[PDB]
């Protein structure tokens, strides 16, 4: 049972909480697979080895259209290799925001697939615990292809050490300690909630606040977009989001619910908008943040940032790359108050996360992107800088930002061409065709 003789590694594919996904080619069978590489040094193993191996064997025995099929498992002296089938379609929410129309029917199909997979896995007595939209992938880029869930049953054995974006979906019983499979349902519920509103039912500025909200267990449907949503869906959400597990609806029961039953043979535009805002700011938001960072800093800020950036830009090309980011990281953090005693590997890892704040994805971090990093969001997106920015964008001072004004500030000046119209619409909540300060602020602060 050895990896190198069985599979061949090529290039990194995706980012996982427990380990990193890499595309691999097979020696003898000549097929492409996806391997999750988990580090014994980086992550802790909760259960003993034999238990993990047993669970993995059971997983290798299993098969369902809505779960990630697990082919092989390899244990290296240093690392763990978890081999399964490949996925090219990417995460679900991205595909959702890619499309123009999103109705309760689509969400019903999605949740049906999810709950089907969940029901199968529960039939074999397996619990995910950590269920997120990221764990929902599409096997192919083809439209209306079905969903496959990944990292099923791995959470029980591993606990990561890196942590905001799992608090939205975690179940109260999981937070309090011991739990059963129904926690997954709760998680699914949360997703469904988002799917219909584009906002988390339990929300907060940071992990602590979000966890406070979910632990309190209280939530509402007061948001305006819920007026566009049928009552049955809200009822199903209520049954899924009950604090006490025994009273909570099971996955199998939920699969036969009235909502999912009926809606599987209007458009929730504000919802999908809020999903786009939720997701990576694939919007006017990135351009606005970059503009604010590069052009709207005070003299002291510009001086300090330019100085530090010069110190980190070793070859002086005007870009920061992986190596320069690594060599300059500890000193940058030393500058930002917050790490002398930092292991080279976690330094490379955090440097990689910052490489995930590389908006244009050219592989380099510019000065503007760098300003987002060096300046905490509290300062860069203060009330003052936001107001000044909005005032700059709003030339005629009407109180709203027009498409033409956006085209004027940072524009090739194609007001038509559906460029600026599409870019505007992604932020235009009330559909007046303009951006008031509320929407600008919500855009840059991910607020609802």
């Amino acid at each position: 049972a050895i990896f190198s003789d069985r599979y061949k590694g090529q290039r990194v594919l995706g980012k996982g909480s427990f380990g990193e996904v890499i595309l691999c080619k097979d020696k003898i069978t000549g097929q492409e697979c996806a391997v999750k590489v988990i580090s014994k040094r980086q992550v802790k193993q909760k259960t003993d080895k034999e238990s993990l191996l047993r669970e993995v064997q059971l997983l290798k025995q299993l098969d369902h259209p809505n779960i990630m099929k697990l082919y092989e498992f390899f244990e290296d002296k240093g690392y763990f290799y978890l081999v399964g089938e490949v996925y090219t379609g990417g995460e679900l929410f991205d595909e959702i925001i890619s499309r123009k129309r999103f109705s309760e029917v689509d969400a019903a199909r999605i949740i049906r697939q999810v709950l089907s997979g969940i029901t199968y896995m529960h039939k074999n007595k397996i619990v995910h615990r950590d269920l997120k939209p990221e764990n929902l992938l599409l096997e192919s880029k083809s439209k209306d292809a079905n969903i496959r869930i990944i990292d099923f049953g791995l959470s029980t054995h591993f606990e990561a050490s890196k942590k905001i974006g799992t608090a939205y979906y975690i179940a109260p019983e999981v937070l309090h300690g011991t739990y059963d499979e129904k926690c997954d349902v709760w998680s699914t519920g949360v997703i469904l909630y988002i799917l219909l509103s584009g906002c988390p039912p339990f929300n907060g500025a940071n992990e602590y606040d979000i966890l406070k909200k979910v632990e309190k267990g209280k939530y509402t449907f007061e948001l305006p977009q819920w007026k566009k949503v049928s009552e049955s869906a809200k009822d199903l959400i209520r049954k899924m989001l009950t604090y006490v597990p025994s009273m909570r609806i099971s996955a199998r029961d939920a699969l036969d619910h009235e909502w999912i039953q009926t809606y599987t043979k209007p458009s929730l535009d504000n919802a999908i908008l809020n999903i786009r805002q939720f997701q990576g700011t694939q919007k006017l938001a990135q351009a606005a943040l970059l503009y604010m960072g590069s052009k709207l800093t005070s003299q002291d800020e510009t001086k300090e940032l330019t100085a530090i950036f010069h110190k980190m830009d070793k070859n002086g090309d005007g870009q920061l790359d992986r190596a320069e980011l690594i060599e300059g990281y500890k000193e940058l953090m030393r500058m930002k108050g917050q790490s002398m005693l930092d292991a080279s590997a976690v330094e490379h890892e955090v440097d990689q996360v910052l490489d995930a704040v590389d908006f244009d994805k050219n592989g380099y971090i510019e000065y503007s992107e760098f300003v987002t990093v060096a300046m905490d969001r509290k300062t860069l997106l203060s009330r003052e800088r936001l107001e000044r920015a909005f005032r700059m964008f709003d030339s005629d001072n009407s109180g709203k930002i027009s498409s033409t004004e956006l085209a004027t500030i940072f524009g090739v000046s194609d007001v038509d061409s559906e460029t600026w119209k599409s870019v505007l619409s992604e932020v235009d909540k009330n559909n007046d065709g303009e951006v008031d300060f509320d929407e600008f602020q919500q855009m840059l602060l991910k607020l609802c």
Partner: nanobody
Amino acid sequence: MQVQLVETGGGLVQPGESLRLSCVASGFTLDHSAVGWFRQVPGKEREKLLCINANGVSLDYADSIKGRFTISRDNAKNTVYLQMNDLKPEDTATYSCAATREFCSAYVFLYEHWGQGTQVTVSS
């Protein structure tokens, strides 16, 4: 005066020839400016070509112009140069230059003080 960049050196040339373009700053100095050259073909969005910081050079464009175009800098003469070699019928377009503070960006929209540019035409 007011603040703008002016381009010169635009003309008609045979394929495979060489041409030199100039960008002069009026109303401000290039001392703290990173200047980049961009080419726009009619009905197409502006394309990053090259950029020079206050000092160093970056090849922003796709590698189609790599090794053929050089960007130069003379602060005293307030001028940025673009040396174009081995011209192709692919290269004919409007060439203009823009400036951002200190460091060369790779987002077109962070640039300012755009110029009317110069017509560069390669024979067909």
